[PDB]
């Protein structure tokens, strides 16, 4: 029922890059999803106490959210685009695992995921 530590957004010994694909993931992908009318539940880790979701972190062992992704991108946490793409996919998958079809939160995730998929389709070739 309590909250875990959030995911890592800083790890100095993890090697880093700032690639054109990672820049696109910040400037295009994250910014598009972040501004969306359905972004708000996803802009920070799930607070299972405040939301009265005592089983959330029993079920979800790889939590992820756009607040974490935003910090990771702004703090150049990643080596490659795939790591960041995986974080977005983890976020959506967690929502689908925890909840049930037709829930509002699932519809919200689906709308964000649609936009994510459109933007990933247009991922630039690495320079
Ligand atoms: C995110 C999320 N993933 N599963 C659930 S059930 C309730 C929520 C939610 C709704 C509004 C604000 C914050 C979280 N979430
Ligand atoms: K489910």
Curated annotation (Swiss-Prot):
Q: Where is this cross-link: Glycyl lysine isopeptide (Lys-Gly) (interchain with G-Cter in SUMO2)?
A: 58
The domain of life is: Eukaryota
- Which compartments does it reside in? Nucleus; Chromosome
Tissue specificity as recorded in UniProt: Ubiquitously expressed.
Q: Where would one find coiled-coil regions in this protein?
A: none
Subunit details for this protein?
A: Interacts with p53/TP53; the interaction is direct. Interacts (via CTD region) with CDK9 and CCNT1, acting as an associated component of P-TEFb complex. Interacts with RELA (when acetylated at 'Lys-310'). Interacts (via NET domain) with NSD3, CHD4, BICRA and ATAD5. The interaction with BICRA bridges BRD4 to the GBAF complex. Interacts (via NET domain) with JMJD6 (via JmjC and N-terminal domains); the interaction is stronger in presence of ssRNA and recruits JMJD6 on distal enhancers. Interacts with NSD3. Interacts with NIPBL.
Q: What family does the Swiss-Prot or TrEMBL record give for this protein?
A: Belongs to the BET family.
Q: What is known of its domains?
A: The NET domain mediates interaction with a number of chromatin proteins involved in transcription regulation (NSD3, JMJD6, CHD4, GLTSCR1 and ATAD5). The C-terminal (CTD) region mediates interaction and recruitment of CDK9 and CCNT1 subunits of the P-TEFb complex. It is also required for maintenance of higher-order chromatin structure.
Any extra remark in the record? JQ1, a thieno-triazolo-1,4-diazepine derivative, and I-BET, a benzodiazepine derivative, have been tested on tumors with success. Treatment with GSK1210151A (I-BET151, a I-BET derivative) has strong effets on mixed lineage leukemia and promotes myeloid differentiation and leukemia stem-cell depletion.
What job does the chain carry out?
Answer: Chromatin reader protein that recognizes and binds acetylated histones and plays a key role in transmission of epigenetic memory across cell divisions and transcription regulation. Remains associated with acetylated chromatin throughout the entire cell cycle and provides epigenetic memory for postmitotic G1 gene transcription by preserving acetylated chromatin status and maintaining high-order chromatin structure. During interphase, plays a key role in regulating the transcription of signal-inducible genes by associating with the P-TEFb complex and recruiting it to promoters.
Disease per record is: Cornelia de Lange syndrome 6: A form of Cornelia de Lange syndrome, a clinically heterogeneous developmental disorder associated with malformations affecting multiple systems. It is characterized by facial dysmorphisms, abnormal hands and feet, growth delay, cognitive retardation, hirsutism, gastroesophageal dysfunction and cardiac, ophthalmologic and genitourinary anomalies. CDLS6 inheritance is autosomal dominant.
Record protein name field: Bromodomain-containing protein 4
Q: Which organism is it from?
A: Homo sapiens (Human)
| Gene that encodes it | BRD4
Q: Which residues of the full protein are shown?
A: 44 to 168 of 1362
């Amino acid at each position: 029922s309590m909250n875990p530590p959030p995911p890592e957004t800083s790890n100095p010994n993890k090697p880093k890059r700032q690639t054109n694909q990672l820049q696109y993931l910040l400037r295009v992908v994250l910014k598009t999803l972040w501004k969306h009318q359905f972004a708000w539940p996803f802009q920070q880790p799930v607070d299972a106490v405040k939301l009265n979701l005592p089983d959330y972190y029993k079920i979800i062992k790889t939590p992820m959210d756009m607040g974490t992704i935003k910090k990771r991108l702004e703090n150049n946490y990643y080596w490659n685009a795939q790591e960041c793409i995986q974080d977005f996919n983890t976020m959506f998958t967690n929502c689908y695992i925890y909840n049930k079809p037709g829930d509002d939160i699932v519809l919200m995730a689906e709308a964000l995921e649609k936009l994510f998929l459109q933007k990933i389709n247009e991922l630039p070739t690495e320079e």
